[PDB]
Design an enzyme around this catalytic site. Structure first.
Site, PDB file in Angstrom:
ATOM      1  N   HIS A  60       0.789  -1.181   0.007  1.00 20.04           N
ATOM      2  CA  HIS A  60      -0.211   0.045  -0.076  1.00 20.04           C
ATOM      3  C   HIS A  60       0.698   1.202   0.085  1.00 20.04           C
ATOM      4  O   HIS A  60       0.288   2.126  -0.295  1.00 20.04           O
ATOM      5  CB  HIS A  60      -0.917   0.054   1.245  1.00 20.04           C
ATOM      6  CG  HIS A  60      -2.368   0.286   0.963  1.00 20.04           C
ATOM      7  ND1 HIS A  60      -2.857   0.518  -0.510  1.00 20.04           N
ATOM      8  CD2 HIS A  60      -3.464   0.982   1.450  1.00 20.04           C
ATOM      9  CE1 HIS A  60      -4.034   0.919  -0.460  1.00 20.04           C
ATOM     10  NE2 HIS A  60      -4.347   1.030   0.816  1.00 20.04           N
TER      11      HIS A  60
ATOM     12  N   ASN B  22      -6.749   6.515   4.010  1.00 24.40           N
ATOM     13  CA  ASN B  22      -8.238   6.896   3.632  1.00 24.40           C
ATOM     14  C   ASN B  22      -8.297   8.500   3.941  1.00 24.40           C
ATOM     15  O   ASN B  22      -9.265   8.916   3.666  1.00 24.40           O
ATOM     16  CB  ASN B  22      -9.174   6.264   4.483  1.00 24.40           C
ATOM     17  CG  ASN B  22      -8.990   6.533   6.170  1.00 24.40           C
ATOM     18  OD1 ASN B  22      -9.844   6.832   6.712  1.00 24.40           O
ATOM     19  ND2 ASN B  22      -7.667   6.215   6.482  1.00 24.40           N
TER      20      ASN B  22
ATOM     21  N   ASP C 174      -0.327   1.993  -5.418  1.00 25.82           N
ATOM     22  CA  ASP C 174      -0.164   0.668  -5.851  1.00 25.82           C
ATOM     23  C   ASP C 174      -1.587   0.160  -6.565  1.00 25.82           C
ATOM     24  O   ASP C 174      -2.570   0.880  -6.300  1.00 25.82           O
ATOM     25  CB  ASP C 174      -0.097  -0.177  -4.424  1.00 25.82           C
ATOM     26  CG  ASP C 174      -1.447   0.299  -3.275  1.00 25.82           C
ATOM     27  OD1 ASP C 174      -1.226   1.443  -2.935  1.00 25.82           O
ATOM     28  OD2 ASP C 174      -2.135  -0.667  -2.883  1.00 25.82           O
TER      29      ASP C 174
ATOM     30  N   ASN D  68      -8.526   3.181  -1.338  1.00 21.08           N
ATOM     31  CA  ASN D  68      -9.305   4.084  -0.279  1.00 21.08           C
ATOM     32  C   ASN D  68      -8.288   5.505  -0.243  1.00 21.08           C
ATOM     33  O   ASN D  68      -9.066   6.412   0.109  1.00 21.08           O
ATOM     34  CB  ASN D  68      -9.096   3.538   1.243  1.00 21.08           C
ATOM     35  CG  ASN D  68      -7.925   3.063   1.766  1.00 21.08           C
ATOM     36  OD1 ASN D  68      -7.816   2.786   3.002  1.00 21.08           O
ATOM     37  ND2 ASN D  68      -6.774   2.843   0.906  1.00 21.08           N
TER      38      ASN D  68
HETATM   39 CL   LIG Z   1      -5.288   1.097   4.708  1.00 17.94          CL
END
Ligand SMILES: [Cl-]
Ligand SMILES: [Cl-]
Ligand SMILES: [Cl-]
Ligand SMILES: [Cl-]
Length: 193
Positions: free
Chosen positions: A20, A68, A93, A114
């Protein structure tokens, strides 16, 4: 023209090696190659720098928000420097591309990411920013996406992602100096030809 390049991340050593954070790996490489070290700037909720890319003044951002809340950092910085969504390149990513592949994109969906979802929101429901999609591949079980993106890749996948990030950094020089068609013609041929 690109005025701001954003590398999406979660904060802390806990997440620095996780899939991420792949967008931040890309921005860290740009900072390294242009000798412009990224440093905390709390009014933009991230680490920032400024580089010369193909004779153009480009700002770098790796948020320190949770993924987020990425939109809070991107909007604060874009608003401060009067940068419009279409002048922003967001590196992230991408589950839909394998390790070793990267692509540029303009607009389109968040692919359930997110950080992209929060940026689209905080830029005024505007998805029409550039993206650098850094392939991380996908888990076999579509139920287990969070555990996958918050996992560290195996060494063989890390080496492929590092190679794709290296190529994407090289293609960013082209994106600024000769435009999106030329940069795409090179980058999307990297594992395709
Ligand atoms: Cl996350
Ligand atoms: Cl996407
Ligand atoms: Cl994978
Ligand atoms: Cl999970």
């Amino acid at each position: 023209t690109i005025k701001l390049i954003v590398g999406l991340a979660n904060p802390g050593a806990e997440y620095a090696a996780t899939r991420h954070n792949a967008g931040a790996w890309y921005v860290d490489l740009l900072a390294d190659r242009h000798r412009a070290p990224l440093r905390e700037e709390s009014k933009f909720f991230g680490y920032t720098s400024r580089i010369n890319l193909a004779g153009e003044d480009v700002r770098l951002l790796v948020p320190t928000t949770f993924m987020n809340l990425s939109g809070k950092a991107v909007a604060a910085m874009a608003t401060f420097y009067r940068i419009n969504p279409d002048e922003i390149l967001v590196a992230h990513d991408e589950l839909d591309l394998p390790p070793g592949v990267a692509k540029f994109k303009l607009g389109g969906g968040h692919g359930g990411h997110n950080g992209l979802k929060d940026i689209i929101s905080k830029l005024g429901n505007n998805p029409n920013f550039h993206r650098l999609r850094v392939g991380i591949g996908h888990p076999g079980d579509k139920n287990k996406v969070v555990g996958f993106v918050l996992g560290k890749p195996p060494a063989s996948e890390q080496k492929l992602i590092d190679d794709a990030v290296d190529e994407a950094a090289r293609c960013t020089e082209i994106l600024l100096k000769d435009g999106l068609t030329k940069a795409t013609n090179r980058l999307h041929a990297f594992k395709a030809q």
